[PDB]
Write a protein that binds this ligand. Sequence first.
Ligand SMILES: C=C1CO[C@H]([C@@](NC(=O)[C@H](C(=O)O)c2ccc(O)cc2)(OC)C(=O)O)N=C1C(=O)O
Ligand SMILES: C=C1CO[C@H]([C@@](NC(=O)[C@H](C(=O)O)c2ccc(O)cc2)(OC)C(=O)O)N=C1C(=O)O
Ligand SMILES: C=C1CO[C@H]([C@@](NC(=O)[C@H](C(=O)O)c2ccc(O)cc2)(OC)C(=O)O)N=C1C(=O)O
Ligand SMILES: C=C1CO[C@H]([C@@](NC(=O)[C@H](C(=O)O)c2ccc(O)cc2)(OC)C(=O)O)N=C1C(=O)O
Ligand code: NI
Ligand code: NI
Ligand code: NI
Ligand code: NI
Ligand code: NI
Ligand code: NI
Ligand code: NI
Ligand code: NI
Lengths: 265, 265, 265, 265
Amino acid sequence: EAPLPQLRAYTVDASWLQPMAPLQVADHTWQIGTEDLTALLVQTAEGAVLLDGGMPQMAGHLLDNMKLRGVAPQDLRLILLSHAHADHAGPVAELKRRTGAHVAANAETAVLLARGGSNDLHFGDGITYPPASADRIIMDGEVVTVGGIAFTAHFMPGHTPGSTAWTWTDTRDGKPVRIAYADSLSAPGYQLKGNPRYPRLIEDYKRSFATVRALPCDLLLTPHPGASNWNYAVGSKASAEALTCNAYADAAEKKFDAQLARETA
Amino acid sequence: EAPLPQLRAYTVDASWLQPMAPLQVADHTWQIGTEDLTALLVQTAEGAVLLDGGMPQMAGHLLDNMKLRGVAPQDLRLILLSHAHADHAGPVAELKRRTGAHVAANAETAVLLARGGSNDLHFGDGITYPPASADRIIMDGEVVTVGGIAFTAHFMPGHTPGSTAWTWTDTRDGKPVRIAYADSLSAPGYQLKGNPRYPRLIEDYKRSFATVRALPCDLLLTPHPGASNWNYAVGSKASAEALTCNAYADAAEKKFDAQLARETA
Amino acid sequence: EAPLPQLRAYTVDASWLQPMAPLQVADHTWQIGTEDLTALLVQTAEGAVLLDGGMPQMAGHLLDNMKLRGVAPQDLRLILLSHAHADHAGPVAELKRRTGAHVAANAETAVLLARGGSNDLHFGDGITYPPASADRIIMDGEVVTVGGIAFTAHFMPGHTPGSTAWTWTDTRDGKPVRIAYADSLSAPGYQLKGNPRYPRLIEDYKRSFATVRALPCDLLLTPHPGASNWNYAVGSKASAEALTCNAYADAAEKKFDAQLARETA
Amino acid sequence: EAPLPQLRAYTVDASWLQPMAPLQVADHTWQIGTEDLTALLVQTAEGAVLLDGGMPQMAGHLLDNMKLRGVAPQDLRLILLSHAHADHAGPVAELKRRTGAHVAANAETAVLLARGGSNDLHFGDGITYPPASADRIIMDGEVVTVGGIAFTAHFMPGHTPGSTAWTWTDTRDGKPVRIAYADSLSAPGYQLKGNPRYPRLIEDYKRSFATVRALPCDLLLTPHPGASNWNYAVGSKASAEALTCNAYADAAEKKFDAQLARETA
Ligand SMILES: C=C1CO[C@H]([C@@](NC(=O)[C@H](C(=O)O)c2ccc(O)cc2)(OC)C(=O)O)N=C1C(=O)O
Ligand SMILES: C=C1CO[C@H]([C@@](NC(=O)[C@H](C(=O)O)c2ccc(O)cc2)(OC)C(=O)O)N=C1C(=O)O
Ligand SMILES: C=C1CO[C@H]([C@@](NC(=O)[C@H](C(=O)O)c2ccc(O)cc2)(OC)C(=O)O)N=C1C(=O)O
Ligand SMILES: C=C1CO[C@H]([C@@](NC(=O)[C@H](C(=O)O)c2ccc(O)cc2)(OC)C(=O)O)N=C1C(=O)O
Ligand code: NI
Ligand code: NI
Ligand code: NI
Ligand code: NI
Ligand code: NI
Ligand code: NI
Ligand code: NI
Ligand code: NI
């Protein structure tokens, strides 16, 4: 008789796990993750902020790149998240242990993080990672400030209930650069219609496309860089083809609408 | 020199703590709280549901009234909440310990419940109560079913971020009675405008008035019975003057608008 | 350049995942796990108790065997644990969701369970499973009662800080059968001496051997049946070769002492 | 008919709430609490450690005294606890929010802290305070290091299951001063014998008296300064009459034995 199946690891494309050196995005903001997963380090006079960390096994690489940027582990003040899936929040528990950083997140992200991504609305227990606690619960539009740099949360539920865009204003060449780190707008394999675990999924996505269109933004980044047409591997040309917020929302909505019709079909 | 102040207890009007015998609302639904705090018991063939419990010190009274209704402690399957303030969720931890019931709540209510109402957006630590955990996180529009009776959640944020209306269809005289247990729409002493802890407070309240207007409803009940013009003390006449959902939302919005203008003034 | 390694699944011997039909241990007590992982169902007039659940993927099998025994999911009242490693507590979160059972455990087991086995003192993040909460914290010697059957906890730290033996008295042929479900006493790959994460590891194991020797016991069972010389696959002869508590403790201490000397060498 | 009683605040002697200026204990160690509640600040080159915080309403006073010592809120790295009762752990949640400090505690202290002191083994819900999470779980004998200063945990269960002594070596006049911050050994109003919630209470206290006798110690301090014959109000003479560890343990055991006999009587 067949035994029960073995547990299956969450495996990803090699490029998601390919380390890169820090890539400067603006005067204080650096991509310090892998070629295909965003992890943004914002360096202030009173400590650093990390927005996402990628996969669980990226924790050491993140700390190495922080050190290259002059940031010792204890200099990391704050971790912010796009959403609490294993490929973006993976190393949060380990980073908290090794740095003392606090995590700020909305209540939906906090509850998913605290169960390590288990009992996911769509993926069940297939993408579990080490659980972590949120130290500060934030509300829509709330401002979190480190070293004078203000980060504003914009809720954009859909990909997860707690999906969040973060905005802040950096500089380049003496001019302001409004950065928008917008969350995923994909629905990979999701049951969109009549989903008992997420009854208003379609209404939330539709509002979130509108929220993304309206973000203050001179430079858009996304957890998966390809979603906004970044290419981290080509250095100073990485941002050349990057989408606007309007274009990112439009592409996501077209995909969503096509998926909805295919689900009907 | 003045010592630091003593801790101050959360004290309430005597009528909020005045026990009453069970008052039948419909064929399966009973008010089993106090004269001025709602606690609804819905009795099914496969166990009971409790919607709110009132103040922390009401736990024993609730269990006594459950016993009068034929419900032993272990027959309580499920606890649902309007919102996780001390005067509505107060006895949840004790009820879970004594009954084995599970709690279902949205993520905002879950995080407030788990910190016992401390660090409230408006009240600070003044209304702390024993913390409890949510066993099931629910989404807007999600259906929770016990003994075939379906309870639907309708999020109506404002009074708390996690404020929820619950609807279900009971019977009376062979006819359906659509019951709506709508949450508080008050903002007592709240800073409404430009509140850093709740930046979209006004937009949430305005949407919640609309949500309440649209609830399926033949009989409205509220956590504070006076908010919907119930009078639990007068028995079979308790519901006589009860408001419609439209009237409840209208009265709440008029009060809110007046408060907003007074806050401006 | 090498990408970072993929996540690695916790894989186990096939026999640990080999389903078996319920095997009666005494009048109310049944082995309902797999050939090589113990999961004990104790059936009372007022609901059932489950002691351990095995691997995460065993949840459905456990519920199937409960149904064969006449126990519907909602009839499971209580889950007790030997220790909160993935191969014994694996399916607890799912079982709680599907049955409404409460978990009772000591504080050490509760904290490890709530982090899903991550940040293990010896195994790091290699054996993470879905986190779950303990509904009742128990103390050493505390009695937990379901349907009149009293289960007594005996702390035996070492294999994990929260390792616990559970004892209860069942019957067979009109005579009492004192059952002892003693936890693992292995230290697989552990650094025993001068371990910064567990400074008193050796003293705890030494006391735990003594605790096991002294347990009230006519029939010993262990989370890994082979540790007490059970063979679940041979049905009515499964218990024939089972060790006494004295013999189990002696074998474990001999292995431990040999390992200590090898660690010195 | 009598309404249910109002909630009752946890009120304490005025001297427990009487602020004092920082009182130097050794070269890096300061009493910064109130006249009758200990809160120790240990200042290192890489941040500060706080051992206990007193009552919930002491948070602002603690931060004021930290500022007098040159310690900005963000310079507080670590909070350690004797035990998680409201009069010693009261302000921990607020301190974490305002400083970013992490809490290190054993599993028993962590679970009591996370429920805000509610469902206390002896006091029920009478001494609840705002819940907080432990960021690091520590084991008996484990060393926690900040700025090169090593703090060692010594478990001494009884007053609470998680009661802990902390030891570290400071200096004065060029010579080492071994400081022992030993927890409470009182059992105020406790049922000592046959306590179902704490079956091995007497055995734990008896071992804890022995643990305290054996602590490395040139200068003993206790959460209630009077328990070790300190008098914080008389400045440079505050330590003059302080007990040794042997004397503190002896006095506590004599009181305990007398209480046990009175409980028998
Ligand atoms: C578009 C995708 C797809 O890849 C990841 C995702 N999914 C996967 O990596 C992948 C998949 O969807 O095929 C997956 C692999 C294994 C699983 O068990 C579950 C999901 O991460 C969990 C997801 O969120 O859907 N994330 C995104 C995204 O937009 O963030
Ligand atoms: C309209 C009210 C006012 O009374 C309670 C409330 N407030 C109070 O009971 C009361 C007050 O607002 O005056 C209060 C007393 C003491 C406090 O520390 C805080 C609040 O409960 C916490 C509140 O939610 O505002 N609840 C409602 C409600 O609509 O639920
Ligand atoms: C003797 C053993 C060994 O097997 C399991 C164990 N270990 C393993 O299954 C196994 C190993 O020790 O070789 C293991 C595989 C993969 C890992 O990442 C970690 C451990 O479960 C986690 C353990 O507790 O050590 N459990 C016991 C036990 O006594 O409970
Ligand atoms: C000796 C005492 C007595 O005072 C406090 C204590 N108790 C009280 O402050 C006090 C009491 O025991 O009389 C109390 C007041 C009100 C309550 O609801 C409970 C306890 O703090 C919770 C306690 O731990 O027993 N603490 C100690 C101690 O040794 O830490
Ligand atoms: Ni995702
Ligand atoms: Ni992703
Ligand atoms: Ni309220
Ligand atoms: Ni209220
Ligand atoms: Ni194990
Ligand atoms: Ni095992
Ligand atoms: Ni105490
Ligand atoms: Ni005290």
